[PDB]
Design a protein around this ligand. Structure first.
Ligand SMILES: Cc1cc2nc3c(=O)[nH]c(=O)nc-3n(C[C@H](O)[C@H](O)[C@H](O)COP(=O)(O)OP(=O)(O)OC[C@H]3O[C@@H](n4cnc5c(N)ncnc54)[C@H](O)[C@@H]3O)c2cc1C
Ligand SMILES: COc1cc2nc(NCCCN(C)C)nc(N(C)C)c2cc1OC
Ligand SMILES: COc1cc2nc(NCCCN(C)C)nc(N(C)C)c2cc1OC
Ligand SMILES: COc1cc2nc(NCCCN(C)C)nc(N(C)C)c2cc1OC
Lengths: 133, 666
């Protein structure tokens, strides 16, 4: 029922290699075509990738910014309120970003804000304009 | 086995069941109650045992009954029936033994036996043992036929049969206690030596051999499991199957390679897409950073939008730097994955040129053992005899196998140098017309009740015929002769004054340059105490090295030997001999094989004796006049000595049943 281990003898394969005088050498040639053509395609993509890797040379070390360590404080300043409103205008409902901009208000505090001042800051109007973009 | 079961096995018989044969002669018993079958079976086994335990002296029915105990020695008709059946069909009192009852004063019936081959000689001894008149007709000047033995001085070497293929149920066991044959085992270790004279390294030798054995199983699988036994309109040879298998192995190796490099490109193209993302990020990053500088340029105090801008851009930029850092983690994972795929590639090739060459020597050993190119063997059927293989070490006859035929011929009437040219068989008898081989004109005629033809299949195959059958042999028989295979193999005897090879190694191989010449001088035997080396030719090569002179062949031989043991260690041979069996007119080849398009069943067709048309039209169906025996007639042991021997014993039995009747069948 089973070929010896490491011999591979398919019904379909047998018919394929036997059907002609040299359907056998045919099949084993077109596998040398496929093989050499894939090895060529590897060369193109190795070369292509090597160029793109030299475009990224230097990493992004020149563009990275050191980190601000500020502690999440419950008091809104008017500064911070205004930051918020603009941050909304630009960021819609993304709390992580708005928290990151203000730099001393946790994500919760921001949602809170959203409801607290919604009336006085028309966070409605602000948000439907964010949507317009 | 051992005990009585040991006799039954040692006589190629199941200890615990009745054979098809025995059913025919004891159909009362085998249709009867179980209990009596086991009595019979014990008796058979027991009598066999006795014969075997001392095969140098005839075993009488009296001495047999005397050794039995009750219940088994009660029914003495049964004991008699058994002992007679065994006597008749050569299971006991066969070969060379001290007869107790001297031979019948008067003989009955007359049988002419063509050829004092081992089959011939075996039959003859039996028939004359049975008391029938027997005369043997041998074209050759000596008995043995394909058992030829070269002798000169103390050099002794078979150019014909050399080996007893195991003693486990081999009748030649019996013979060997009757004739003193210097039986000696064969150490099966065979070191190879490439083209150049370099021993093949154990690494390779083991790898290649295993691949061989694997390839064989493969064929067997193609045969039975996939039914690849007929290709196109023709049958498939072992050769084609092996090619197709090997083609499919090289195919796989490329398929492996293909899908492995296709992994690499599919990965490489992921990496490519990742790098384009990474570059277009690095560009938005440069640009954002610039904007964030330009927005920190504006100096405090600044209004709130300006402050927003700085903070905004600061956040937008650290988002993108975060994203880019996680792309560069990804990049590292792929780039190492690719270094691992580069590191672990599938094998480059199925087999190298050096590998294939070694694999060819393993095929040449197969070609030698079958005596023919694997392109001639039947895929399905070549191996069919392998089931009946004997158990035990293979052995050589050290003092020459001819000792056996010679000893068998003692006491027989053998006409040497008498070349049968025509066999005439009719309802009323037979005449055989021979000539003298020395003098083609001088003519002999022999008349007899029956003719036993041991003519080698090569001969029976001859066109135009060396022997003429009157009337012609039936189409069913001629087609059997035509379909069956007769092969060729050759030996080169190299007799040297001093031993320069390894005295503890019986045989070593030489690997051929090409596929074409793999068989050519591919193997050497050192079995003889004396300093003799045998070189064997096989496969397609044997058939061609018959056309090359001995000086040239011995040349090529020494070449190879010098290459393996060095120019100053290999003398000239004192004596050289080279077989050509396909040339020999009395063999016309070496032995049989199961050609493609042929079945084990043809070996039965060959044994089937022939019954002539009636003399007077509308007269009763006559007796069967012509009988065949020999290596090519025994389906279960072809191409062997023991096979022949057995076939001889079988026709002797059948002939005497015909011509002296069977007392046992009642
Ligand atoms: C090189 C070689 C090595 C072998 N090695 C082994 C081995 O190692 N082990 C093993 O078990 N078997 C071996 N065999 C096979 C074995 O020897 C034979 O199958 C066996 O001897 C067959 O005996 P036979 O009686 O059928 O035919 P043969 O022994 O050939 O008998 C036929 C006889 O008929 C004669 N004859 C032919 N034509 C005529 C004619 N027209 N008129 C009168 N007589 C004629 C022949 O000359 C011969 O004497 C080997 C064979 C060969 C060639
Ligand atoms: C007559 O000599 C041989 C017969 C053999 N028969 C067999 N039969 C194996 C059974 C069938 N296989 C397809 C599995 N195997 C051998 N080596 C593995 C044999 C090896 C033999 O000699 C080396
Ligand atoms: C299927 O397994 C095998 C069967 C074999 N059968 C044989 N048979 C010998 C041929 C029998 N007669 C035609 C003489 N020989 C082998 N190696 C030399 C064999 C070798 C085999 O594999 C090792
Ligand atoms: C059919 O079964 C087998 C037959 C075999 N025949 C042979 N013949 C070569 C002779 C080995 N000894 C009897 C000396 N060898 C085998 N292994 C080395 C065999 C191994 C076999 O299978 C286990």
């Amino acid at each position: 029922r089973k070929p010896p281990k490491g011999m591979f003898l398919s019904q379909e394969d047998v018919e394929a290699v036997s059907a002609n005088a040299t359907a056998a050498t045919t099949v084993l040639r077109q596998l040398d075509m496929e093989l050499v053509s894939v090895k060529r395609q590897i060369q193109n993509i190795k070369q292509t990738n090597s160029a793109l890797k030299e475009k990224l040379d230097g990493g992004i070390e020149p563009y990275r910014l050191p980190e601000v360590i500020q502690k999440c404080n419950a008091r809104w300043t008017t500064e911070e309120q205004l930051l918020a409103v603009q941050a909304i205008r630009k960021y819609g409902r993304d709390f992580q970003a708005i928290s990151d901009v203000i730099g001393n208000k946790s994500v919760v505090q921001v949602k809170n804000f959203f409801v607290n001042y919604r009336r006085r800051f028309n966070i409605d109007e602000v948000l439907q304009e964010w949507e317009a973009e | 086995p051992s005990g009585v079961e040991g006799a039954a096995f040692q006589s190629r018989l199941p200890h615990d069941r009745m054979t098809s044969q025995e059913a025919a002669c004891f159909p009362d018993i085998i249709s009867g109650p179980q209990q009596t079958q086991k009595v019979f079976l014990f008796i058979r086994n027991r009598t066999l045992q006795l014969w075997l335990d001392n095969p140098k002296i005839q075993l009488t029915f009296e001495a047999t009954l005397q050794q039995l105990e009750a219940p088994y020695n009660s029914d003495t008709v049964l004991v008699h029936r058994v002992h007679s059946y065994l006597e008749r069909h050569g299971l006991i009192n066969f070969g060379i033994y001290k007869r107790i009852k001297p031979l019948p004063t008067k003989k009955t019936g007359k049988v002419i036996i063509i050829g004092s081959g081992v089959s011939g000689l075996a039959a003859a001894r039996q028939l004359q043992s049975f008391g029938m008149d027997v005369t043997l007709l041998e074209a050759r000047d000596r008995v043995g036929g394909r058992v030829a033995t070269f002798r000169k001085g103390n050099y002794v070497a078979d150019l014909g049969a050399m080996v007893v293929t195991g003693l486990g149920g081999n009748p030649m066991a019996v013979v060997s206690k009757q004739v003193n044959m210097e039986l000696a085992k064969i150490k099966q270790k065979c070191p190879l030596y490439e083209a150049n004279g370099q021993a093949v390294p154990k690494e390779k030798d083991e790898m290649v051999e295993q691949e061989f054995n694997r390839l064989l199983e493969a064929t067997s699988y193609l045969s039975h499991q996939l039914d690849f036994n007929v290709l196109n309109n023709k049958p498939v040879s072992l050769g084609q199957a092996l090619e197709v298998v090997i083609q499919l192995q090289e195919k796989h190796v490329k398929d492996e390679q293909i899908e492995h490099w296709k992994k690499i490109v599919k990965t490489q193209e992921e990496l490519k897409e990742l790098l384009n993302k990474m570059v277009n990020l690095k560009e938005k990053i440069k640009e954002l950073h610039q904007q964030y500088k330009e927005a920190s340029e504006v100096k405090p105090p600044r209004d709130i939008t300006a402050e927003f801008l700085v903070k905004s851009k600061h956040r937008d930029l650290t988002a993108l730097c975060k994203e880019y850092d996680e792309l560069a983690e990804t990049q590292g994972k792929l780039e190492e994955k690719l270094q691992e795929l580069e590191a672990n590639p599938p094998s480059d090739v199925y087999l190298s040129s050096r590998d294939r060459q070694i694999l060819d020597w393993h095929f040449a050993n197969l070609e030698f053992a079958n005596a023919t190119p694997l392109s001639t063997l039947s895929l399905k059927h070549w191996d069919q005899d392998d089931d009946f293989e004997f158990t035990g070490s293979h052995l050589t006859v050290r003092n020459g196998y001819s000792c056996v035929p010679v000893a068998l011929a003692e006491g027989l009437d053998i006409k040497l140098n008498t070349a049968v040219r025509q066999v005439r068989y009719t309802a009323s008898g037979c005449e055989v017309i021979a000539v003298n081989t020395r003098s083609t004109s001088q003519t002999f005629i022999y008349k007899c009740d029956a003719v036993l033809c041991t003519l080698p299949l090569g001969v029976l195959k001859q066109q135009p015929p060396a022997v003429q059958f009157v009337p012609p042999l039936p189409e069913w028989k001629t087609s059997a002769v035509q379909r069956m295979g007769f092969g060729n193999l050759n030996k080169v005897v190299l007799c040297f004054d001093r031993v320069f090879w390894d005295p503890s190694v019986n045989l070593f191989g030489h690997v051929g340059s090409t596929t074409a010449s793999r068989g050519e001088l591919f193997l050497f035997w050192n079995l003889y105490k004396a300093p003799i080396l045998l070189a064997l030719v096989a496969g397609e090569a044997a058939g061609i090295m018959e056309n090359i002179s001995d000086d040239v062949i011995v040349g090529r031989c020494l070449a190879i030997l010098k290459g393996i043991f060095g120019s100053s260690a290999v003398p000239q041979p004192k004596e050289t001999v080279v077989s050509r069996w396909r040339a020999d007119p009395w063999a016309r080849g070496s032995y049989s094989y199961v050609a493609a398009g042929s079945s084990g069943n043809d070996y039965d067709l060959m044994a089937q004796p022939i019954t002539p048309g009636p003399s007077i039209p509308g007269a009763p169906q006559p007796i069967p006049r012509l009988f065949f025996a020999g290596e090519h007639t025994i389906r279960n042991y072809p191409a062997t000595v023991h096979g022949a021997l057995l076939s001889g014993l079988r026709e002797a039995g059948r002939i005497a049943d015909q011509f002296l009747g069977a007392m046992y069948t009642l």
